[PDB]
């Protein structure tokens, strides 16, 4: 039994990969204790605290910076747990409800992306500075 699903913030993309195992969750090649922050440790584990002792998840990432790469992993963990219970339904609908009660970003992701830069200005919407007189 195995399911292979992705998360995605901004321009991060983190794939996760469930198996059967013994409660091992592994970023890149290493346990998800080791992200070295104390904020972002507790951010990745928000999926897991709410709700996997059967499952064995194996997560790989590219894209984004330090923050958005974490927010992909929260999607990829939580979606892969929900996608496991869907394949292998009563209990899937109620454990998925506990996430959507907490916060919508653990399943849905957000479609906002950066606005292109426009001419006459240093960025998108800013413009340089007038003179007059």
């Amino acid at each position: 039994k195995s399911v292979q699903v992705f998360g995605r913030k901004k321009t991060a993309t983190a794939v996760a990969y469930c198996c059967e195992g013994s409660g091992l969750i592994k970023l890149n090649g290493t346990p998800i204790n080791m992200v070295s922050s104390e904020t972002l440790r507790a951010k990745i584990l928000e999926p897991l605290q709410l709700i996997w002792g059967n499952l064995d998840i194996r997560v790989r990432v590219h894209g984004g910076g330090h923050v958005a790469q974490v927010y992909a992993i929260r999607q990829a963990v939580a979606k892969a747990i929900v996608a496991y219970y869907q394949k292998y339904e009563a209990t899937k609908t109620e454990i998925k409800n506990t996430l959507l009660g907490y916060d919508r970003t653990l399943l849905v992701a957000d479609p906002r992306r950066m606005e292109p830069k426009k001419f006459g200005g240093q960025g998108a919407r800013v413009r340089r500075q007038m003179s007059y007189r």
Partner: protein, 305 residues
């Protein structure tokens, strides 16, 4: 006689197009507009009637019609996607998709004996596939095709009769054996012909846009009787055991006793300038115990005589 509200149950967020029930009891499947088709399982214990068992995520549009094996193993389902999907009942996972049908596909049935898959839609042809998954016969008609149904039993040797109900008005009936020659063709409905079902015995057939449920003859044709519904009806389905026939209006479900020749009941449950839920499909269970009906907000309601 009339029948009380047993149980509403919901797990389905958009509307429900069609609904069907596997043999004996337990396991009904509600094809959904959400594009995800569930299967349930029936406890029949006080508060909850059922709880959902699988979800069939695969199609890229609404799921039109859903049809079942005699075993309750290997169900089939279709969508506007222009494809069909055989799904293993136990493990989900599409077994094989179907490819050939051009426009949105509106209607599916099996035979009695798991022989011929009968897909249909808005290319103006009833395709007959093999259970393997390759196209045998390509029957033809004037307009679009909303619905189909298949005659019960037949013991293999008997032709397996395929009633069809069209968008323009007409109602085709066909044999199979091998070549599939239509027994009769007729202008069954005045304008739009919504939904088609058989009588269990299969002497008669049922079709009915212009607020008129009309029974016809299987061989050859022409009407036995014409009733008049109060407001225009989306699905029709006769009872298996007892002599009933029933019809999903806006205002309720008009319960004809066929011998007494009149509406004995009309059952809508209680709930300005709004439509409020229609019922878009019916499903009698195989015993004739219970009447399920799928609704437009996204719910299903059970009544038992």
């Amino acid at each position: 006689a009339h029948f009380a509200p047993r149980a509403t149950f919901v797990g389905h967020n958009a509307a429900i197009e069609s609904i069907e029930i596997d043999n004996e009891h337990n396991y009904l499947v509600s094809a959904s507009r959400d594009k995800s088709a569930l299967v349930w399982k029936l406890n029949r214990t006080q508060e909850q009637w059922a709880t959902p068992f699988t979800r069939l995520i695969g199609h890229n549009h609404f799921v039109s019609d859903v049809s079942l094996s005699r075993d309750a193993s290997h169900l089939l389902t279709s969508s506007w996607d222009s494809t069909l999907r055989l799904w293993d009942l136990s493990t989900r996972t599409t077994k094989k998709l179907f490819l050939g049908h051009k426009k949105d596909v509106l209607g599916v049935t099996f035979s009695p004996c798991n022989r011929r898959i009968i897909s249909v839609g808005r290319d103006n042809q009833v395709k007959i596939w093999n259970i393997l998954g390759e196209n045998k016969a390509e029957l033809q008609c004037s307009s679009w095709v909303t619905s189909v149904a298949c005659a019960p039993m037949a013991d293999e040797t008997s032709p397996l009769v395929i009633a069809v109900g069209c968008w323009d008005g007409k109602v085709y009936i066909w044999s199979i054996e091998k070549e599939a020659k239509l027994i009769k063709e007729f202008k069954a409905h005045d304008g739009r012909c919504t939904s088609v079902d058989f009588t269990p015995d299969g002497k008669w057939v049922i079709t009915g846009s212009d607020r008129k449920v009309v029974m016809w003859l299987t061989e050859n044709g022409a009407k036995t009787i014409s009733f008049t519904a109060p407001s225009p009806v989306h699905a029709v389905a006769a009872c298996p055991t007892q002599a009933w026939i029933c019809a999903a209006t806006y205002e309720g479900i008009a319960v004809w006793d066929i011998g007494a020749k009149q509406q004995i009941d009309l059952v809508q449950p209680n709930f300005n300038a709004g439509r409020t839920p229609d019922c878009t499909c019916l499903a009698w269970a195989a015993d004739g115990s219970v009447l399920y009906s799928g609704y437009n907000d996204g719910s299903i309601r059970a009544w038992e005589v």
